[PDB]
Amino acid sequence: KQEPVAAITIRTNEGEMGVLAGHEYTVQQLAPGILEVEYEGGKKDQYVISGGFAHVNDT
Amino acid sequence: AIAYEVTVNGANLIGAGMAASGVGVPAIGVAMCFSSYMLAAARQPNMSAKLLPYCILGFALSEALALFTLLIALLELFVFS
Amino acid sequence: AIAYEVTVNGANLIGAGMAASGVGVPAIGVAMCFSSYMLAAARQPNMSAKLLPYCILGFALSEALALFTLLIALLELFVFS
Amino acid sequence: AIAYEVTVNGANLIGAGMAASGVGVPAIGVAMCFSSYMLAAARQPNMSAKLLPYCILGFALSEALALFTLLIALLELFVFS
Amino acid sequence: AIAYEVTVNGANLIGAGMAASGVGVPAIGVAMCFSSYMLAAARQPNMSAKLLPYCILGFALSEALALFTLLIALLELFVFS
Amino acid sequence: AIAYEVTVNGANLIGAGMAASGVGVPAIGVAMCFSSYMLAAARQPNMSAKLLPYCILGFALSEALALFTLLIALLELFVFS
Amino acid sequence: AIAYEVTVNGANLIGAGMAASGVGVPAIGVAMCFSSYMLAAARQPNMSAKLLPYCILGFALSEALALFTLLIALLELFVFS
Amino acid sequence: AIAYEVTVNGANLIGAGMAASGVGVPAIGVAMCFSSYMLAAARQPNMSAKLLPYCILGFALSEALALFTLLIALLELFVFS
Amino acid sequence: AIAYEVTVNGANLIGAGMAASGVGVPAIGVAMCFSSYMLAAARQPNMSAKLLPYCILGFALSEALALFTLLIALLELFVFS
Amino acid sequence: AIAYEVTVNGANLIGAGMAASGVGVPAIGVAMCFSSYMLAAARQPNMSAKLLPYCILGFALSEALALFTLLIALLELFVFS
Amino acid sequence: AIAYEVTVNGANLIGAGMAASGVGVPAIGVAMCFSSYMLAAARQPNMSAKLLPYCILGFALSEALALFTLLIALLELFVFS
Numbered sequence A: 001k002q003e004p005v006a007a008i009t010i011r012t013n014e015g016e017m018g019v020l021a022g023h024e025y026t027v028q029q030l031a032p033g034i035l036e037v038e039y040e041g042g043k044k045d046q047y048v049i050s051g052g053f054a055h056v057n058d059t
Numbered sequence B, C, D, E, F, G, H, I, J, K: 001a002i003a004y005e006v007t008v009n010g011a012n013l014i015g016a017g018m019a020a021s022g023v024g025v026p027a028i029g030v031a032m033c034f035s036s037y038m039l040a041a042a043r044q045p046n047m048s049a050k051l052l053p054y055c056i057l058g059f060a061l062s063e064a065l066a067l068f069t070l071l072i073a074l075l076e077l078f079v080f081s
Helices: B009-013 B015-023 B026-043 B045-077 C012-022 C025-043 C045-077 D011-023 D026-043 D045-075 E011-021 E025-043 E045-078 F015-022 F025-043 F045-075 G011-021 G025-043 G045-075 H009-013 H015-021 H026-043 H045-078 I009-021 I025-041 I045-075 J011-020 J026-043 J045-075 K015-023 K026-043 K052-075
Strands: A007-011 A016-019 A027-029 A034-038 A044-048 A053-055 B002-008 C002-008 D002-008 E002-008 F002-008 G002-008 H002-008 I002-008 J002-008 K002-008
Touching: A016 K026, B002 B009, B002 I009, B009 B015, B009 B045, B009 C002, B009 C012, B009 I009, B015 B045, B015 C012, B015 C045, B015 I009, B026 B045, B026 C025, B026 C045, B026 I025, B045 C045, B045 I009, B045 I025, B045 I045, C012 C025, C012 C045, C012 D011, C012 D045, C025 C045, C025 D026, C025 D045, C045 D045, D011 D045, D011 E011, D011 E045, D026 D045, D026 E025, D026 E045, D045 E045, E011 E045, E011 F015, E011 F045, E025 E045, E025 F025, E025 F045, E045 F045, F015 F045, F015 G011, F015 G045, F025 F045, F025 G025, F025 G045, F045 G045, G011 G045, G011 H009, G011 H015, G011 H045, G025 G045, G025 H026, G025 H045, G045 H045, H002 H009, H009 H015, H009 H045, H009 J002, H009 J011, H015 H045, H015 J011, H015 J045, H026 H045, H026 J026, H026 J045, H045 J045, I002 I009, I009 I045, I009 K015, I025 I045, I025 K026, I045 K015, I045 K026, I045 K052, J011 J045, J011 K015, J011 K052, J026 J045, J026 K026, J026 K052, J045 K052, K015 K052, K026 K052
Parallel strands: B002 C002, B002 I002, C002 D002, D002 E002, E002 F002, F002 G002, G002 H002, H002 J002, I002 K002, J002 K002
Antiparallel strands: A007 A016, A007 A034, A027 A053, A034 A044
């Protein structure tokens, strides 16, 4: 819930995308695969998903 | 061997067109810069004020290349006999 | 050695034909601008008013190079004998 | 040094074949403009009325360059001796 | 100062080649236009009929530039000696 | 002045090459049209049958320009003495 | 006026070089066509059999233009004196 | 009228350069035919092997066009006087 | 055979035009570079700081090529007889 | 008809330029082949290992075309009289 | 048959320009390469290191061609009489 995060990496049908702060507003599918979160401490957290929709914000 | 120096004065006015043919290519860069700035600004208005310097710089360099291409021709004709 | 100056009077009417080849090359570099404005306004219509200046600005200069490519062809013929 | 002025009457015409090479290159900027209008309206139909003006503008000016490139090629034969 | 006026009758024809080199460039614009219509119909079939007039207009005008270029190339032969 | 009319019979067989330079330029546009049909059918197969008539149509017209270019290269050799 | 007919024999070949210059441009259309087929089949493999015919057709057509251009380049040496 | 056959042996070695200007062009098709495949494999790994034949096909055909362009240049010299 | 040397001084003032044609093309490289920087920054501003040096490098070496071309057009004229 | 054979020692060096004009064009086929590897690798890093065999291959063969387009420019000068 | 060997000392200075025109073309491949790096890094920043070498590598190769296209234009002038 609203965790501070440094970076995140998603998978799509067009291919693998990588989101950082201030990324452009884009809404798109999530292809069924893995999802990497990277906190400010340099650690990482991988999650398997089953589809979805990623809603990114400029803010 | 015999030696015939020849001086075609009219060649003053042929090479100028060959530079003029290239004066117009940098325009493609110019718009290709501004055309980008819109699309970027379409995807991120918040960044529109930070991208303009790089836009003006690319424009200036393209324009300067065209300016030298034209400066040859204007220098080719108006001084050479 | 021997020296033959020559004055080809038809060369005047050759470089114009080669300079004018580059008058249309800015055209792709002109409509690229307006086309991009349409794409941006289609992406973010709200931003359209803030994009129209730069568009015009690019067109004010991308076209100018074409004129600087045409001027030669009109400055090459009508004044040079 | 010797003075050989020469007047080549064929150069009345060769240049019109060169400038005419640059009469087609605006057509791509043309079709770019119209294609962009199509793709923009496909991205935002309700904006199609507001983008059509800009299209025409860019179009005409691109075409205008062709006309000048077409003027020379017709200004170079029907009057020049 | 001597004057050698020369009438090159073969320069009737060389330019007719060069002009023809420009007749193909409008084809890529024609294809750009039809491609845009296809992709827009694939993006929004409801706009299939609304966009087609602009497609025909752009094709007509690219083809017309090609037509004037071919007109130069042919007029450059069948009337000029 | 002095009048030397020259009939260069080799210019018969020069412009035919120059025109042949432009016969290939339509091919890239040709391929553009078919590429667009492919990607349009991919985005929407249901519209494929509706987009094919333009595709074919586009090809022919593009090809026509190339053909006319080729015709000059065939009209420049096999009739000119 | 005086009449100098000249038969320049080297012009049998200088055009062939230019006739070779247009042989390469159609290759871009060939490659564009196969690239489009690849991308479309990757977006919709189930359409791969329905799009493959038009692909081959585009290749043959573009290559036909290249063949005509090359045809001049070979029809300009082995037959013309 | 008078008849002057001129045999310019040095024109052996101009077209061989001119043709070379069109020998490098098919590369842009060639690389494209590869550049697509990666993206196709990027869009769908499973469809790599099904798409490789068309990659090699477009490659070979564009390279053969370049080879026929080079054939004129190398044949323009080592057999022709 | 017989031996006629010739020294065409006008060739000094032709190639400088032929070179100047290619001075404008690198402007497209400059613009392509900056346009890429914008459309990358507008996708990820955090990488702007990491992408600006490469962009900087991109419009140096490109520009440098143009300068060499322009240098020839200044090294062809102001030194050669 | 009369027979004036000529052996031009300067056209042993013009064609080199016309060949060198085409040595820089296949550079595009380089970048387009490496650029595609980047974006593909960005879209699917785990595929980068199997895409690289294609990239360098297309590059090398494009470079082969450029090498021949340059090899004439070296073969046109250092061996011919 | 009569034989006139001729030594043109001006061709020395023309081909360089014709080579110089091809020196600016690799710049567009340069920019294509660096732009690809920027956009791929924007897609995947974690790959920004792993894609850096290829970029540089690709650049150098394109640059190498320009050097050759610049080598001749410097090897054509300052050694040839």
